[PDB]
Amino acid sequence: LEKLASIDAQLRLLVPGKVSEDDKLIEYDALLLDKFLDILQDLHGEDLKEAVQECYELSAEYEGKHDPKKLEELGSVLTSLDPGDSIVIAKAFSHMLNLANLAEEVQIAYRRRIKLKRGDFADEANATTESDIEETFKKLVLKLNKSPEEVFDALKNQTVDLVLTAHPTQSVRRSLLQKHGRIRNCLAQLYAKDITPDDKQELDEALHREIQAAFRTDEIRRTPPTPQDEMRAGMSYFHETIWKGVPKFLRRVDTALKNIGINERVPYNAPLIQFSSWMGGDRDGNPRVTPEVTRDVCLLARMMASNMYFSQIEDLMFEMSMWRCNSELRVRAEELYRTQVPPTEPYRVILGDVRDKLYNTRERSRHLLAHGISDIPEEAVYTNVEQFLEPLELCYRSLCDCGDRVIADGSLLDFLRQVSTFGLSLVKLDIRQESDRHTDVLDAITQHLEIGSYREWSEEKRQEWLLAELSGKRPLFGSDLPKTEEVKDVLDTFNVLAELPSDCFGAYIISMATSPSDVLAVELLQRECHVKHPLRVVPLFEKLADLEAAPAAMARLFSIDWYRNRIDGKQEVMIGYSDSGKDAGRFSAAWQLYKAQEEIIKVAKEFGVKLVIFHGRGGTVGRGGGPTHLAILSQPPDTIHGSLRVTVQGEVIEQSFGEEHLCFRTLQRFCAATLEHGMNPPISPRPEWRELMDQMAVVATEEYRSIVFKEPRFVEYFRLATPELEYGRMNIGSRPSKGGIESLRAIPWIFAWTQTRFHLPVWLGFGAAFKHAIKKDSKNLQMLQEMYKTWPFFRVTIDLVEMVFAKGDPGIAALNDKLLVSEDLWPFGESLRANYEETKDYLLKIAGHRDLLEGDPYLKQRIRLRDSYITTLNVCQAYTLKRIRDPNYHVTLRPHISKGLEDTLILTMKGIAAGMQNTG
Amino acid sequence: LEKLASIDAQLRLLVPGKVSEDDKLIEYDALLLDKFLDILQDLHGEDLKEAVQECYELSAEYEGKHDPKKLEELGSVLTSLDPGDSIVIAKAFSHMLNLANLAEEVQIAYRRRIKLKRGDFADEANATTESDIEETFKKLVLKLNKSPEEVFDALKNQTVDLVLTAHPTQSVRRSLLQKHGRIRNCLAQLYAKDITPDDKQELDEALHREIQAAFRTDEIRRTPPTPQDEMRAGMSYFHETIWKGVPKFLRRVDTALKNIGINERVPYNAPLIQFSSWMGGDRDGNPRVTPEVTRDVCLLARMMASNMYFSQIEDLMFEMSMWRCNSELRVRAEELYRTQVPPTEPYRVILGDVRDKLYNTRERSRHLLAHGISDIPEEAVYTNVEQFLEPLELCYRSLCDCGDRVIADGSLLDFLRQVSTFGLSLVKLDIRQESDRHTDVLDAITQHLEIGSYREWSEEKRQEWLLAELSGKRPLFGSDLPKTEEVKDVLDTFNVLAELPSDCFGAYIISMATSPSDVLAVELLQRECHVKHPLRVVPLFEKLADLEAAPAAMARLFSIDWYRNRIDGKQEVMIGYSDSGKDAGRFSAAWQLYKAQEEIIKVAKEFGVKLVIFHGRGGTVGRGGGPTHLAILSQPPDTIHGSLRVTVQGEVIEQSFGEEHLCFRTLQRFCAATLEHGMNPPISPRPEWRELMDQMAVVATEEYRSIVFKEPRFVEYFRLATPELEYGRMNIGSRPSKGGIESLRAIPWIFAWTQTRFHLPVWLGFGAAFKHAIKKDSKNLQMLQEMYKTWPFFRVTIDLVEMVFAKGDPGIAALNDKLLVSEDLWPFGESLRANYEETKDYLLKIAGHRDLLEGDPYLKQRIRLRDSYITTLNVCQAYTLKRIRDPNYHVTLRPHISKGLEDTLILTMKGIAAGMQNTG
Amino acid sequence: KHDPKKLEELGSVLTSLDPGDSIVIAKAFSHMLNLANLAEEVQIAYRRRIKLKRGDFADEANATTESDIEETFKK
Ligand SMILES: N[C@@H](CC(=O)O)C(=O)O
Ligand SMILES: N[C@@H](CC(=O)O)C(=O)O
Known part of the structure; x- marks a missing residue:
């Protein structure tokens, strides 16, 4: 019994x-x-x-x-x-x-x-003792002599980008x-x-x-499951906790701000939090991840996101029963009505029109996934996040103008934050591919053109040539280019990036990067495959020897006028703890990477480039919980500088985001630690x-x-x-x-x-x-x-x-x-x-x-x-x-x-x- | 400050x-x-x-x-x-x-x-001291010598019908x-x-x-608002608390049963709880409530209900991930699949097909509301609740057969109870109209036919004639009947009852009823307007003099072979406390109605008819809270006998159902008091x-x-x-x-x-x-x-x-x-x-x-x-x-x-x- | 038993x-x-x-419900 x-x-x-x-x-x-x-x-x-x-x-x-x-x-x-x-x-x-x-x-x-x-x-190494967002604000004002206005300012300009992986x-x-x-x-x-x-x-x-x-x-x-199916499963935590957790955490930030004397709220469109993804994007040593898989996951992202906005806007519509608006909203409402709610409920007329666009955005995406073609025209759908934000901004303004800011600051504000944080997909997709594969494509091209073998060229030649072609007056190759299967696969991936909208994507990561030509090769491929808005190119340095040369590599890139102009003062570099540890052992990799990051920051400073370090798997920041907080605070000085990009390891994601409190504390600690570090680096070693x-x-x-x-x-x-x-x-x-x-x-x-x-x-x-x-x-x-x-x-x-x-x-x-x-x-x-x-x-x-x-x-x-x-x-x-x-x-x-x-x-x-x- | x-x-x-x-x-x-x-x-x-x-x-x-x-x-x-x-x-x-x-x-x-x-x-007059369902069970076993099996039995056969009003x-x-x-x-x-x-x-x-x-x-x-709009607003409490409250209360009943030693659960299709409605159905002294209004609210009911089932089944589908089924479900699943989920998820294939039927049931209803015509055929929709129950019964059985009863008894069971309690609409509609209006229709008919004036006939004649026509071999009138506007309105209402499905409706209440001809008049009208499944006819006795004669009226009806056969051993009679009190004062009405109910029960007993008293507004059972509990226990002996029908007054509905705990206690007390009374009448007066x-x-x-x-x-x-x-x-x-x-x-x-x-x-x-x-x-x-x-x-x-x-x-x-x-x-x-x-x-x-x-x-x-x-x-x-x-x-x-x-x-x-x- | x-x-x-x-x-x-x-x-x-x-x-038959001295005064 x-x-x-x-x-x-x-x-x-x-x-x-x-x-x-x-x-x-x-x-x-x-x-x-x-x-x-x-x-x-x-x-x-x-x-x-x-x-x-x-x-x-x-x-x-x-x-x-x-x-x-x-x-x-x-x-x-x-x-x-x-x-x-x-x-x-x-x-x-x-x-x-x-x-x-x-x-x-x-x-x-x-x-x-x-x-x-x-x-x-x-204290920052355990959930029970770590600093919450208010404690971090108060610490910065008291122990580091910052005005609240300064703390507020740093925070508005801060991003934390959590990258979801398989x-x-x-x-x-x-x-x-x-x-x-x-x-x-x-x-x-x-x-x-x-x-x-x-x-x-x-x-x-x-x-x-x-x-x-x-x-x-x-x-x-x-x-096994298809990569598409594995991506869907990976995206589950949005419905579970992230979707609500984000607005909930942003509201806490607002309270922390009232409590240190700043009366404003973080603007709804300050990008404090972003999510990215690798699922369907990483093909490095993985040929199941095809061009078609990539095309698909970007469609699935779009579908899921718009399905969520569609369903949520219905709730928002219930709440927005109010009848008082400013004249700007009145005008708009009456227009829409003239083209199924009463006009005495103007917020609902606006939001209803947003709802149909969202339904359309969602059906178009499903059609394209199932068939390649949609009878639904692009004009009747959202293709940029600002088209979606505008009518919501109009509601917000209209409410405040009528004396009802307090109402605007509830569910509407939650929604503006969700839209702004998640955007039209929920995640932007990184692509990752190994540099040899780019070399092969380039060697196929040079041999076809009968001007030699790119593989055989030295590094100085590769650069000289890649720069001559990046300002070339004349396309490099056509469709009639003879291609191995592997080379066709790399090209078809770039063609996907050309076709799909730029809000689907983030970084093109080059695995096994070692030289400036590695990065320039991808820039050229993107231009020659007609990617109107090229993804930023991010080198991943793996071996100890590669980490040693990384700083000089980045010095060379930055000193090239074309690339400097192209990069517009921003560069991301990726490190992979597990990878580097496989080459030299964990201890030696840990130290090298501390030094690597100091050295790369130094070089960025010298060239006036803002540098973002993307933390790949295996680092102490991947642990989750309290330990993630101290891990962030322990980064070398100036290596975050307002931008944290970090991998959420799949084997840690449940613990980090599965339960709603834990999800809230995860977002919190990423924001807290990032803000503190930029103003309070750790002690530099003796x-x-x-x-x-x-x-x-x-x-x-x-x-x-x-x-x-x-x-x-x-x-x-x-x-x-x-x-x-x-x-x-x-x-x-x-x-x-x-x-x-x-x-x-x-x-x-x-x-x-x-x-x-x-x-x-x-x-x-x-x-x-x-x-x-x-x-x-x-x-x-x-x-x-x-x-x-x-x-x-x-x-x-x-x-x-x-x-x-x-x-x-x-x-x-x-x-x-x-x-x-x-x-x-x-x-x-x-x-x-x-x-x-x-x-x-x-x-x-x-x-x-x-x-x-x-x-x-x-x-x-x-x-x-x-x-x-x-x-x-x-x-x-x-x-x-x-x-x-x-x-x-x-x-x-x-x-x-x-x-x-x-x-x-x-x-x-x-x-x-x-x-x-x-x-x- | x-x-x-x-x-x-x-x-x-x-x-x-x-x-x-x-x-x-x-x-x-x-x-x-x-x-x-x-x-x-x-x-x-x-x-x-x-x-x-x-x-x-x-x-x-x-x-x-x-x-x-x-x-x-x-x-x-x-x-x-x-x-x-x-x-x-x-x-x-x-x-x-x-x-x-x-x-x-x-x-x-x-x-x-x-x-x-x-x-x-x-103790039964206050929420804090009243008996819950377990206490009532225990009281019946201990103080009234009932076996739990007997208590269980009474409960299975019990109905409580709460009738929503404007x-x-x-x-x-x-x-x-x-x-x-x-x-x-x-x-x-x-x-x-x-x-x-x-x-x-x-x-x-x-x-x-x-x-x-x-x-x-x-x-x-x-x-004002249209009666359609007033009906929609009245139906709000389903989404708020009733929809979940019902399954929640039924689960409590299950626990009370385990705790007095009965190991079974109330069958999912025992009709313990039902809701009816008057909204769009009561036209007595209210010509805004037209035939068209009635047609509409029945469509709106159908639409709302199927919208709820449609949305809920999606959740159920998530839960029913299991792969083990009996062969009967296997067969069915494979059929449906052969005609968009994997076949390795058989419950989802069944429920998906139910989902489309529900979506169809819902679009058909909306079309008919907006236009009168639907391209959606009746074959692709639910028209009877059993068509909807069957595949859910199949899931339940399949789960139990595979050893997973425990799972069946969660969300699936909640759903079977919801479907069974709410049926295809959420409420069945009563119609109510005053008896003069029926007399006028009948007088228009007799005058047209040139056989005299029904209004002028005595009561003995009216009955003689109405019975001769109810077994007549020959229709009474056609479309070419000359009609006042009011007479056309009564006829068109009956034509609506003929066209619409019988699960939309419940009672046809005759206001100002006083004689057997009042009831027989409606029976004839229904037959002559070709209502294939006639609504039961319910007389509402209003004045003191009318309550005095009510028993003889019901004795006469029951002693007429046609009506007796027709009624199949069941009759409902309605009382209206406020109405009777307007004629004689509250005290005198209270007493008369105690006596009226004793006398009508006596007459029903004598004729072997089961009698249901429908409590209209103004009675002590309408108070809500604890007082409703004692009020039920205080009904005269044998006047409930397993069937409580009662008006939920609109001015009490928020208090009774707006907050989820209160909603749960309301359902509870109606079940508790009804069960107790049938086995424990109050003391009869000295x-x-x-x-x-x-x-x-x-x-x-x-x-x-x-x-x-x-x-x-x-x-x-x-x-x-x-x-x-x-x-x-x-x-x-x-x-x-x-x-x-x-x-x-x-x-x-x-x-x-x-x-x-x-x-x-x-x-x-x-x-x-x-x-x-x-x-x-x-x-x-x-x-x-x-x-x-x-x-x-x-x-x-x-x-x-x-x-x-x-x-x-x-x-x-x-x-x-x-x-x-x-x-x-x-x-x-x-x-x-x-x-x-x-x-x-x-x-x-x-x-x-x-x-x-x-x-x-x-x-x-x-x-x-x-x-x-x-x-x-x-x-x-x-x-x-x-x-x-x-x-x-x-x-x-x-x-x-x-x-x-x-x-x-x-x-x-x-x-x-x-x-x-x-x-x- | x-x-x-x-x-x-x-x-x-x-x-x-x-x-x-x-x-x-x-x-x-x-x-x-x-x-x-x-x-x-x-x-x-x-x-x-x-x-x-x-x-x-x-109520006066049990400690838990009986009247104390103030309740008795007030009564
Ligand atoms: N995530 C924990 C370890 C674990 O839960 O196994 C940590 O890094 O300390
Ligand atoms: N419904 C309460 C009265 C009220 O709340 O006003 C009662 O009948 O006692």
Whole structure:
């Protein structure tokens, strides 16, 4: 009848909880698990529930003592399941994990903020202590001597651009987030103080039902989804929380402003917040992302957006019942009426006409998507956001003129902000393609023209030629140009950019950029494919050597008159932490990128160019939560200067935007941190620190490279101990290599090692670095410790690695070796595990910590509560990999318990990924 | 800066408040007023705010001491306003009043229920103590020895039919209720314990803004709205609260059932709840309600309903992502797919097809409304509710078959209940017409045929003839029948009933019914106008003499074979409390109707007919709130027998259904009380009581009639002291007479006297009755007191009159006399006021009360808080009536203060009506 | 349930005690009873008075509804 107390007590044995009336995470997990076990019993029988229970207990005992025999006990239960039973159990543990995450969201959403606080930079690393927008304003006036008018001014001119990217292991379906949403809402509401008995009986029932609906929305799908479908799923968070969150956060900004003495509101059309997207735009090493895919996602964006505006304007129309207007609106209303509402309701006549334009904008888009042709003419549709804003501006003005500003400042204002923030699509699409592919197009052209081979030319020649053609008097090539399939694909992409309207797009990112010709090549292609409004061109520098030359590259570009004129004082450059870390190791990349950004800003300053750094995946700003706040504050001085552009990693998007409070705090912290930084850079490092970082980077890079690139048996080891081959072949997303580790892409590199709980890519090299700093001079420990206490960059860098170790378990990696790796390679695995421990030890000593995450007990608890579930998936995954790979491995199967191995593997890969979220 | 405390302290001086953490009404009023005064100042200037403040203080002092000089002080401020200033001030007091009412709704919504209670019938007269559905179940099992299975059974077979009617002084616009809704929601949320500082800053701002939006949604409209427009406005509460409230209440019933040991749910298609409507159907004394109007409202009903189902099914479709179905659904899905979703989502394929049918059903209806013709064929649309239910039943079954009943029992089940409760329209329309109009049609027919004059025939002849024609072999008349306009209008109404589908309609009510021929006449007309499925015919007995003969009338009908066969064991009869009270006075009508219902039930029993009493306006069941609960329990034994049909008076509908909690409790109490009564009738009166009531009724009727019909100067007095002539001429709704008071309609009779705060129609006759009972025999006081303590009917009857006196102020009626009535008629007014006081005194002594509403302090406080505002409107109204009626009356006007007299009068009439709500 | 066999079950456990054990058990139950009474006193001491009440003589039969001295004066 009542097992809720036993589940709760076994959880609390695993976590020494807390008295706080806000700490209820363990209660939430108990309740969710209890309901879930009941469901399992109802659907699959007591015996199956019992088996799930059996596996959980074994995992619990392992997370207690860490006796590795428990993993083999769990193994022998898991390997003895027919594949139908295995699927149900892998699905159970997967679902318990998701539930644990939902519980976490609710806990974070309602945790009390701390009132008394030091106001130093460590407060900015946690949701509970970080500065909200009013606190940041007040800090700037008080501690940095800014007039409120100055703070207001900075804020009006500030942009934060969040760039949405593909979930690496497939995005959750839109209907599943709504279910999740309802589970969270029922969970929140069962603990409200405001309500009675029966309401709770009903919430209990609602929650039970919703845990079940979620579990049975589980269709089994080896064959991937189209990039169009993956884009739709990625766009779900707009309907869920972003659409309302934006106006809600802007209203908070307004209140913060009243409270520091500024009586105005942020203008509705100040572009504080923008969203961009990569989904259907990034084709770098991904030929499923075709020209047609791009054309489609831009149409889908347009369709979704206008569908939202269409539906919202109906609500606005209800509200705008008022009859008093200025004469300017009167005139307009009467015109429209003369060409189905009364004229005594003038706002409704205007908004009704906007509604039809929006309906038209939406049907035109759908037609073009389904057929290429629409009977709906462009004249009857919105093609620029200002056409849509104008009549809304007219309403606003008319209301204020009549004395009803207060009304204008409600729903109408929310709407102006939505329109202005989201514009006609909800996101602008970046295109990304690798520079070789541009070279190939250009070599096809030069060879056709019989003037030689662009590939063979030196860099000085490439520039000389590209500039001569960018002011050429004469087109380069036609349709009759002989093209490989790949070259046709690059050209057809540019033709899409020419055809489609410029408000669909943002950046053309060049992967593997290294020279000025890389950027000039794209400028020429765009001009020659007749892109009337060329996308800005953004180089992505990947390797350490490429980051070293980046500054000179940008100096050259800027000193070219054509390009300088063309760029109109703005340039964006992209960095990719995971990418650079794959080349030199994480530590060395972190340092190089700090320096790279200082150096590129210096060069921009010199040429009078405004420089925007676009943060790609793997940086500490990608963590989400409080840690994102300190991460922003820790950027090098002047590297934001009013413009934050940052990747929202798909594996972090739910946590960041799925729950409405969290979404609000995410937007808040991006605005707060950006504003503060531009007026309050972090401390610049001491010379001694720089010098030590340079020495440490050399050593760190040497360790990492000698293991990852010069150990001849490394790739072999990697392919056995890691599910990277099976991630590739069951392709979850893109496709894994472009050869060895040079050839492998960042995401698969991280994912392979996250799946084994070993995380090599995040920590390798730090151990050599610290060890060597300290042997060289024992005083370096103190300096390292001081850097941790007082240099934000360094704090933040260590904290991310510390978090990754909290998600680590070398016991799991050892089990994979035992099962999957040949005995000859075992000492190699064991030395890599010795390196993990040694690296971890040094990290703890530098942070002044006895255990992992001592500074962040809330995060410690969250991670520890996930581990029981993830661990079962890991053991299941290891033995499933053994069965797939080795046909001659068999065990006695149990008789079927409930009422394909590849399917199990897909399920465990996604679960472990849902559990590990962000690492590097 | 802070006047909130002065407003609050001046209110609390007027009401000696309470410590209860739930009693916040006075705080709510303070806050709402403070924000409102600020708005007035911003929009109209300090001086205008000051004037409103000045008028409020004078009204406050009057409600304190009741010095009548204060009314003249207020008068002299009000009469000195140019008409533009007068409009703004009347609008201010009107808006403050509405605000006071919103505050009240919130107070009632969140007041704590009382846990310990006597469980006697007085507990059922208040929201805080009344029985909910679980308590009623438990009472029936425990105190009446019913098995839960029996209780379940009674409930499955029970119907409650709430019949929506026209607001007597015009329905609030749909957009204004939404605003109201938002003001309430902001008010509730400012006192939530669950939230922080800034949230409140924002709610403050939201509330201020919404009070302003409401104030400026105020267009000035002498020219009435069409009956179609008045029907649309009446239907607003479906979107607001009823649409969700129904499934929500049915789910509560399910929980109550689990909790008394019944594991089933009420079947989704048990018709526990139904709504009907009169709007566009009642034409009795109202020629604006034409055949075309009726045709229209049935189309609008159909349109609205299908628009709601269409929009809701989209949500349901999102939820129904599941892939497991039974084979029956599989087959169907694949068929539909073969004729735009994947087939792996079978519920969505079914629901999508339902969605298109719903869209079609909705466009067909709109076309027919706008043009008479639709290209959309009937085959592609729903014409019967079962066509719509079938595919939903299929989903339900399929889910249960696959083990997912728990899922079926969520949103799908809510939807089945909505569909089944609301059906294809949301309401079925009654038609009502007066019996003379039928006689005229029949006389036109007999004269045409040259067989004499139906009007001239006796009742025995009329029946003989109507029965001969109802089994006639030969049609009565054609199109070439010569018709007056009125006769054509009655025929064309029947032709509408023939053309339109039978699910649009319910009852054909015959006003002024008195004989069996009245009912047989309509049966014949329906047959001869070719109504394939005739509406049931329902007689409305109005006069005392008509109620006396009603039983014999029904005995005759039932003993006629044709009619008996035709009626298939069911008959509805309607009673109209206000109507009968206009003929004989309220007391005498109350008693007659108790007896009438006993007698008609007796006759039905004898003939084996199931009898449904339809309660028209003015009864104690129309009060709303707790009092509706005891009122139902107090019906005579066996007079409900599983079927409650009751009028929801337009002047009570906001209070009953505007706020979601109140809507839920309204549905609850109708179900609770109906179920209990059928198993637990009230005590039948003692013989001594009957005898005393008969003696008291004679005397009560004689007093009332001698004043209202035999005093030759009464009508003259009535037309001077009352705004009834101006209610008529500025027609707010219907139109006032059909002559004298016989000729005047109930609603205008009540409204005239409610506007003067005198309420003559509710209390007159009670005084003579009680006085005479007590002089005859001093022991009668004790018996009267005992009847009050132990006979529910009597309690409830006195309580309604007591409530009306709480809304009374003879000081106001005296002011009207002084200003509007000629001096010769002043002693007449003064004797009527002497009668008020004497009647009130006796009422207090019988109830054992020292002051009005001592038994109901919550209601006492609510009424007292309204009075300040209503009183200002009353004084304004009195002097405005003086100006309209007397051109030679003038006063010095103030210079204009802010930055038509008929308009002011409309405004004061509506305000006083919004303030007085229900009386008789 | 009021199954009378339970009294004899209890009997057979109680009659089988040496007199030293019997004393200690009778003393335990005696003390548990006193404890129960102390708990009752605390419950009655802090139970909330009921604000809304009929003001008839039945209210005077319970601590929670009876009239205090001010209510009696006012009455
Ligand atoms: N997003 C969290 C980690 C997690 O939730 O797994 C962080 O970066 O600290
Ligand atoms: N509806 C309330 C009266 C009112 O709210 O004015 C009642 O009948 O008691």
